[PDB]
mmCIF file of C-alpha atoms (C1' of nucleotides) and ligand atoms in Angstrom:
data_model
loop_
_atom_site.group_PDB
_atom_site.id
_atom_site.type_symbol
_atom_site.label_atom_id
_atom_site.label_comp_id
_atom_site.label_asym_id
_atom_site.label_seq_id
_atom_site.Cartn_x
_atom_site.Cartn_y
_atom_site.Cartn_z
ATOM 1 C CA UNK A 1 46.388 3.848 -19.251
ATOM 2 C CA UNK A 2 44.288 4.750 -22.306
ATOM 3 C CA UNK A 3 41.261 2.816 -23.559
ATOM 4 C CA UNK A 4 40.670 2.759 -27.319
ATOM 5 C CA UNK A 5 37.429 1.761 -29.051
ATOM 6 C CA UNK A 6 36.411 2.053 -32.703
ATOM 7 C CA UNK A 7 33.086 3.686 -33.546
ATOM 8 C CA UNK A 8 32.594 2.511 -37.131
ATOM 9 C CA UNK A 9 34.691 1.233 -40.025
ATOM 10 C CA UNK A 10 33.659 1.874 -43.623
ATOM 11 C CA UNK A 11 35.065 1.139 -47.074
ATOM 12 C CA UNK A 12 34.928 3.961 -49.629
ATOM 13 C CA UNK A 13 35.539 3.655 -53.357
ATOM 14 C CA UNK A 14 37.072 5.949 -55.966
ATOM 15 C CA UNK A 15 36.640 5.266 -59.675
ATOM 16 C CA UNK A 16 39.702 4.747 -61.872
ATOM 17 C CA UNK A 17 40.004 3.509 -65.443
ATOM 18 C CA UNK A 18 39.684 -0.233 -64.903
ATOM 19 C CA UNK A 19 37.471 -0.345 -61.834
ATOM 20 C CA UNK A 20 36.851 0.931 -58.340
ATOM 21 C CA UNK A 21 39.639 1.263 -55.777
ATOM 22 C CA UNK A 22 38.927 0.971 -52.071
ATOM 23 C CA UNK A 23 40.098 3.084 -49.137
ATOM 24 C CA UNK A 24 39.106 2.281 -45.558
ATOM 25 C CA UNK A 25 38.087 4.903 -43.015
ATOM 26 C CA UNK A 26 37.693 4.347 -39.292
ATOM 27 C CA UNK A 27 36.558 6.352 -36.272
ATOM 28 C CA UNK A 28 38.314 5.773 -32.943
ATOM 29 C CA UNK A 29 37.671 7.184 -29.470
ATOM 30 C CA UNK A 30 40.314 7.108 -26.740
ATOM 31 C CA UNK A 31 39.690 7.898 -23.089
ATOM 32 C CA UNK A 32 41.078 7.426 -19.599
ATOM 33 C CA UNK A 33 37.593 7.485 -17.994
ATOM 34 C CA UNK A 34 38.943 10.306 -15.799
ATOM 35 C CA UNK A 35 37.664 13.278 -17.814
ATOM 36 C CA UNK A 36 39.860 13.211 -20.919
ATOM 37 C CA UNK A 37 38.516 12.032 -24.283
ATOM 38 C CA UNK A 38 39.756 12.049 -27.854
ATOM 39 C CA UNK A 39 38.188 11.474 -31.276
ATOM 40 C CA UNK A 40 40.020 10.524 -34.455
ATOM 41 C CA UNK A 41 39.151 9.632 -38.056
ATOM 42 C CA UNK A 42 41.826 7.725 -39.976
ATOM 43 C CA UNK A 43 41.974 6.708 -43.634
ATOM 44 C CA UNK A 44 44.278 4.076 -45.115
ATOM 45 C CA UNK A 45 44.331 1.530 -47.968
ATOM 46 C CA UNK A 46 43.809 -1.237 -45.376
ATOM 47 C CA UNK A 47 41.730 -1.529 -42.199
ATOM 48 C CA UNK A 48 44.376 -2.026 -39.446
ATOM 49 C CA UNK A 49 46.449 0.908 -40.687
ATOM 50 C CA UNK A 50 43.286 3.030 -40.678
ATOM 51 C CA UNK A 51 42.489 1.994 -37.097
ATOM 52 C CA UNK A 52 46.032 2.786 -35.937
ATOM 53 C CA UNK A 53 45.976 6.148 -37.730
ATOM 54 C CA UNK A 54 42.607 7.005 -36.189
ATOM 55 C CA UNK A 55 44.060 6.145 -32.787
ATOM 56 C CA UNK A 56 47.010 8.476 -33.352
ATOM 57 C CA UNK A 57 44.737 11.288 -34.570
ATOM 58 C CA UNK A 58 42.415 10.771 -31.592
ATOM 59 C CA UNK A 59 45.297 10.948 -29.122
ATOM 60 C CA UNK A 60 46.335 14.176 -30.861
ATOM 61 C CA UNK A 61 42.836 15.719 -30.450
ATOM 62 C CA UNK A 62 41.979 15.670 -26.740
ATOM 63 C CA UNK A 63 39.121 17.211 -24.754
ATOM 64 C CA UNK A 64 38.980 17.843 -21.001
ATOM 65 C CA UNK A 65 35.507 17.039 -19.642
ATOM 66 C CA UNK A 66 34.322 18.659 -16.354
ATOM 67 C CA UNK A 67 32.555 15.712 -14.743
ATOM 68 C CA UNK A 68 30.401 16.344 -11.655
ATOM 69 C CA UNK A 69 29.758 13.018 -9.880
ATOM 70 C CA UNK A 70 29.797 10.826 -12.968
ATOM 71 C CA UNK A 71 27.502 13.173 -14.902
ATOM 72 C CA UNK A 72 27.540 16.451 -16.842
ATOM 73 C CA UNK A 73 27.305 19.890 -15.151
ATOM 74 C CA UNK A 74 24.626 21.320 -17.461
ATOM 75 C CA UNK A 75 22.510 20.318 -20.449
ATOM 76 C CA UNK A 76 23.932 21.069 -23.903
ATOM 77 C CA UNK A 77 22.607 21.154 -27.460
ATOM 78 C CA UNK A 78 25.028 21.211 -30.403
ATOM 79 C CA UNK A 79 24.401 21.362 -34.153
ATOM 80 C CA UNK A 80 27.234 19.964 -36.269
ATOM 81 C CA UNK A 81 26.101 20.269 -39.870
ATOM 82 C CA UNK A 82 22.618 18.788 -39.998
ATOM 83 C CA UNK A 83 23.288 16.544 -36.986
ATOM 84 C CA UNK A 84 22.085 17.621 -33.548
ATOM 85 C CA UNK A 85 23.182 16.213 -30.198
ATOM 86 C CA UNK A 86 21.217 16.907 -27.011
ATOM 87 C CA UNK A 87 22.841 16.152 -23.651
ATOM 88 C CA UNK A 88 21.257 16.371 -20.208
ATOM 89 C CA UNK A 89 22.758 15.425 -16.824
ATOM 90 C CA UNK A 90 21.221 12.598 -14.824
ATOM 91 C CA UNK A 91 21.152 11.479 -11.211
ATOM 92 C CA UNK A 92 23.326 8.485 -10.243
ATOM 93 C CA UNK A 93 21.872 5.059 -10.876
ATOM 94 C CA UNK A 94 20.520 6.192 -14.255
ATOM 95 C CA UNK A 95 23.189 4.917 -16.638
ATOM 96 C CA UNK A 96 24.355 6.252 -19.982
ATOM 97 C CA UNK A 97 21.429 6.395 -22.421
ATOM 98 C CA UNK A 98 22.626 7.236 -25.931
ATOM 99 C CA UNK A 99 23.198 5.918 -29.408
ATOM 100 C CA UNK A 100 26.238 3.753 -30.036
ATOM 101 C CA UNK A 101 28.527 6.672 -30.981
ATOM 102 C CA UNK A 102 27.724 9.088 -28.108
ATOM 103 C CA UNK A 103 27.556 6.182 -25.653
ATOM 104 C CA UNK A 104 31.087 5.117 -26.579
ATOM 105 C CA UNK A 105 32.419 8.685 -26.471
ATOM 106 C CA UNK A 106 30.859 9.469 -23.090
ATOM 107 C CA UNK A 107 31.765 6.113 -21.524
ATOM 108 C CA UNK A 108 35.411 6.621 -22.449
ATOM 109 C CA UNK A 109 35.165 10.123 -20.932
ATOM 110 C CA UNK A 110 34.222 8.665 -17.541
ATOM 111 C CA UNK A 111 30.504 9.495 -17.639
ATOM 112 C CA UNK A 112 28.224 7.067 -15.808
ATOM 113 C CA UNK A 113 24.740 8.662 -15.893
ATOM 114 C CA UNK A 114 23.513 10.995 -18.648
ATOM 115 C CA UNK A 115 20.612 11.401 -21.091
ATOM 116 C CA UNK A 116 21.146 12.090 -24.793
ATOM 117 C CA UNK A 117 19.179 12.417 -28.011
ATOM 118 C CA UNK A 118 20.373 12.445 -31.623
ATOM 119 C CA UNK A 119 18.312 14.687 -33.904
ATOM 120 C CA UNK A 120 18.244 15.543 -37.586
ATOM 121 C CA UNK A 121 21.047 13.703 -39.360
ATOM 122 C CA UNK A 122 21.960 10.403 -37.691
ATOM 123 C CA UNK A 123 25.354 10.413 -39.423
ATOM 124 C CA UNK A 124 27.828 8.751 -37.009
ATOM 125 C CA UNK A 125 30.693 11.059 -38.031
ATOM 126 C CA UNK A 126 28.713 14.277 -37.596
ATOM 127 C CA UNK A 127 27.097 12.965 -34.398
ATOM 128 C CA UNK A 128 30.579 12.217 -33.036
ATOM 129 C CA UNK A 129 31.843 15.690 -33.945
ATOM 130 C CA UNK A 130 28.760 17.270 -32.352
ATOM 131 C CA UNK A 131 29.324 15.265 -29.162
ATOM 132 C CA UNK A 132 32.960 16.399 -29.116
ATOM 133 C CA UNK A 133 31.993 20.058 -29.528
ATOM 134 C CA UNK A 134 29.371 19.597 -26.801
ATOM 135 C CA UNK A 135 31.986 18.288 -24.371
ATOM 136 C CA UNK A 136 34.239 21.160 -25.471
ATOM 137 C CA UNK A 137 31.486 23.725 -24.779
ATOM 138 C CA UNK A 138 30.967 22.539 -21.192
ATOM 139 C CA UNK A 139 31.530 25.062 -18.405
ATOM 140 C CA UNK A 140 31.849 24.559 -14.658
ATOM 141 C CA UNK A 141 30.442 26.964 -12.088
ATOM 142 C CA UNK A 142 34.059 27.888 -11.353
ATOM 143 C CA UNK A 143 34.583 28.779 -15.019
ATOM 144 C CA UNK A 144 31.345 30.789 -15.061
ATOM 145 C CA UNK A 145 32.288 32.898 -12.040
ATOM 146 C CA UNK A 146 35.810 33.180 -13.473
ATOM 147 C CA UNK A 147 34.450 34.788 -16.641
ATOM 148 C CA UNK A 148 32.340 37.258 -14.616
ATOM 149 C CA UNK A 149 35.070 38.577 -12.297
ATOM 150 C CA UNK A 150 35.547 42.011 -13.868
ATOM 151 C "C1'" U B 1 14.426 10.171 -11.170
ATOM 152 C "C1'" G B 2 13.685 11.490 -17.303
ATOM 153 C "C1'" G B 3 14.863 11.104 -23.593
ATOM 154 C "C1'" A B 4 19.487 4.918 -27.383
ATOM 155 C "C1'" G B 5 18.477 3.909 -32.497
ATOM 156 C "C1'" A B 6 19.121 0.771 -36.997
ATOM 157 C "C1'" G B 7 18.290 -1.006 -42.492
ATOM 158 C "C1'" U B 8 17.311 1.173 -47.202
ATOM 159 C "C1'" U B 9 18.314 5.977 -53.341
ATOM 160 C "C1'" U B 10 25.133 6.144 -54.840
ATOM 161 C "C1'" G B 11 30.880 3.364 -57.871
ATOM 162 C "C1'" A B 12 31.729 6.240 -53.189
ATOM 163 C "C1'" U B 13 29.917 10.935 -50.262
ATOM 164 C "C1'" C B 14 26.972 14.764 -47.676
ATOM 165 C "C1'" C B 15 21.883 16.284 -47.382
ATOM 166 C "C1'" U B 16 16.678 16.039 -48.148
ATOM 167 C "C1'" G B 17 12.986 12.326 -47.866
ATOM 168 C "C1'" G B 18 9.629 8.308 -47.572
ATOM 169 C "C1'" C B 19 9.278 3.040 -46.499
ATOM 170 C "C1'" U B 20 10.661 -0.701 -42.868
ATOM 171 C "C1'" C B 21 12.457 -2.932 -38.156
ATOM 172 C "C1'" A B 22 13.735 -3.326 -32.702
ATOM 173 C "C1'" G B 23 9.433 -1.392 -27.784
ATOM 174 C "C1'" G B 24 4.822 -1.387 -25.155
ATOM 175 C "C1'" G B 25 -0.403 -2.432 -25.426
ATOM 176 C "C1'" U B 26 -5.571 -5.681 -26.726
ATOM 177 C "C1'" G B 27 -12.914 -7.546 -24.748
ATOM 178 C "C1'" A B 28 -8.594 -10.231 -29.639
ATOM 179 C "C1'" A B 29 -8.699 -13.977 -33.477
ATOM 180 C "C1'" C B 30 -5.798 -17.985 -36.321
ATOM 181 C "C1'" G B 31 -1.647 -21.956 -36.588
ATOM 182 C "C1'" C B 32 1.364 -25.632 -33.899
ATOM 183 C "C1'" U B 33 1.502 -27.209 -28.872
ATOM 184 C "C1'" G B 34 -0.852 -27.837 -24.347
ATOM 185 C "C1'" G B 35 0.217 -30.170 -17.018
ATOM 186 C "C1'" C B 36 -1.996 -27.745 -12.069
ATOM 187 C "C1'" G B 37 -4.071 -23.684 -9.296
ATOM 188 C "C1'" G B 38 -5.590 -18.454 -7.734
ATOM 189 C "C1'" C B 39 -7.665 -13.917 -9.393
ATOM 190 C "C1'" G B 40 -9.805 -11.449 -13.473
ATOM 191 C "C1'" U B 41 -12.233 -11.732 -18.083
ATOM 192 C "C1'" G B 42 -15.364 -13.465 -22.281
ATOM 193 C "C1'" C B 43 -21.330 -11.109 -29.266
ATOM 194 C "C1'" C B 44 -16.242 -5.631 -30.672
ATOM 195 C "C1'" U B 45 -20.695 -8.377 -36.035
ATOM 196 C "C1'" A B 46 -27.360 -8.307 -37.057
ATOM 197 C "C1'" A B 47 -30.023 -2.226 -31.569
ATOM 198 C "C1'" G B 48 -31.002 -9.282 -36.503
ATOM 199 C "C1'" A B 49 -34.909 -13.052 -35.199
ATOM 200 C "C1'" C B 50 -36.170 -15.854 -30.701
ATOM 201 C "C1'" A B 51 -38.629 -22.095 -28.542
ATOM 202 C "C1'" U B 52 -38.462 -22.954 -23.275
ATOM 203 C "C1'" G B 53 -37.860 -22.014 -17.841
ATOM 204 C "C1'" C B 54 -37.032 -18.263 -14.209
ATOM 205 C "C1'" A B 55 -36.182 -12.914 -13.831
ATOM 206 C "C1'" A B 56 -41.877 -8.344 -9.234
ATOM 207 C "C1'" G B 57 -44.006 -8.619 -5.758
ATOM 208 C "C1'" U B 58 -45.778 -8.222 -0.852
ATOM 209 C "C1'" C B 59 -49.314 -7.125 3.266
ATOM 210 C "C1'" G B 60 -55.382 -11.503 7.006
ATOM 211 C "C1'" U B 61 -52.106 -6.049 12.198
ATOM 212 C "C1'" G B 62 -56.810 -2.139 5.929
ATOM 213 C "C1'" C B 63 -61.983 -4.839 4.099
ATOM 214 C "C1'" G B 64 -65.972 -8.184 2.635
ATOM 215 C "C1'" G B 65 -66.440 -12.776 0.312
ATOM 216 C "C1'" G B 66 -66.409 -17.782 -2.835
ATOM 217 C "C1'" C B 67 -64.929 -23.145 -2.695
ATOM 218 C "C1'" C B 68 -63.472 -27.457 0.273
ATOM 219 C "C1'" G B 69 -63.343 -29.328 5.507
ATOM 220 C "C1'" C B 70 -63.764 -29.603 10.861
ATOM 221 C "C1'" G B 71 -65.648 -28.175 15.766
ATOM 222 C "C1'" G B 72 -69.336 -25.895 19.163
ATOM 223 C "C1'" G B 73 -74.355 -23.600 19.565
ATOM 224 C "C1'" G B 74 -80.429 -22.000 18.877
ATOM 225 C "C1'" U B 75 -84.166 -27.234 17.964
ATOM 226 C "C1'" U B 76 -87.119 -33.297 20.726
HETATM 227 K K1 K C 201 25.826 25.653 -36.138
HETATM 228 K K1 K C 202 25.471 3.413 -46.715
HETATM 229 MG MG1 MG C 203 36.944 22.332 -19.496
HETATM 230 MG MG1 MG C 204 20.580 22.465 -40.382
HETATM 231 MG MG1 MG C 205 15.969 13.037 -41.544
HETATM 232 MG MG1 MG C 206 15.632 17.199 -7.652
HETATM 233 MG MG1 MG C 207 15.485 18.133 -11.910
HETATM 234 MG MG1 MG C 208 16.042 7.177 -42.595
HETATM 235 MG MG1 MG C 209 19.934 9.089 -57.743
HETATM 236 MG MG1 MG C 210 23.751 -0.185 -55.265
HETATM 237 MG MG1 MG C 211 27.838 10.088 -59.456
HETATM 238 MG MG1 MG C 212 4.325 -4.201 -32.233
HETATM 239 MG MG1 MG C 213 3.950 -6.040 -30.624
HETATM 240 MG MG1 MG C 214 -5.714 -29.050 -29.529
HETATM 241 MG MG1 MG C 215 -11.569 -19.229 -13.339
HETATM 242 MG MG1 MG C 216 -17.753 -15.669 -15.187
HETATM 243 MG MG1 MG C 217 -24.158 -5.275 -29.663
HETATM 244 MG MG1 MG C 218 -13.522 -1.834 -29.380
HETATM 245 MG MG1 MG C 219 -50.659 -1.922 9.028
HETATM 246 MG MG1 MG C 220 -71.644 -27.943 11.703
HETATM 247 MG MG1 MG C 221 -85.457 -25.295 25.497
#
RNA sequence: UGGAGAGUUUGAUCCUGGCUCAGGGUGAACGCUGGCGGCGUGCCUAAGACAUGCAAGUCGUGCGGGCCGCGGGGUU
């Protein structure tokens, strides 16, 4: 019912008298490929607990994506921190062209053809957050005319 | 009908930032290897120096001759 894929897994270290102590962080995307996505970042002393926690957090943070024939309705450009994500809809038969992080996010969202570009900071976390805010800032023509009723 | 990034400064992080890699290209060269054909292509350097052969001539329907030869005339 819900597909779950990890973006990256990293091991961080804090200094304590005696040595360094490790804490694992993991990004996880979850999607039904129908228009709903979710991003989560979990931290835990071990890796599997971090992956499970990231899955829970991702299921708790969902985003409804207005797909229009496997693609996006309009091009977007989002700055998260120093990271920039540029999205642009594509005709069918194009395929998803993106870095690993935005490719995973968009594929789990149900996108089939789109063009992207990562700019500035290539940080996977910030790129993921920028992609999420881009999908959150998407508007359909119905939404546009709904906002301009008056 | 068109756009992917990654490695690397830190104990760990975010940023800035350079270096590097994955791609495509060549009148190429070098190493190892090397079976056939078609179509292309082949002094990027000394516009340095060149043996040798060929590469620009053709018209007797413009004109008069020379040399070699033959035939027929004026003459016993
Ligand atoms: K901003
Ligand atoms: K790192
Ligand atoms: Mg929406
Ligand atoms: Mg900025
Ligand atoms: Mg940069
Ligand atoms: Mg069109
Ligand atoms: Mg167009
Ligand atoms: Mg860099
Ligand atoms: Mg330093
Ligand atoms: Mg180090
Ligand atoms: Mg320090
Ligand atoms: Mg190359
Ligand atoms: Mg090459
Ligand atoms: Mg040989
Ligand atoms: Mg040949
Ligand atoms: Mg030839
Ligand atoms: Mg030359
Ligand atoms: Mg040249
Ligand atoms: Mg004439
Ligand atoms: Mg005679
Ligand atoms: Mg007589």
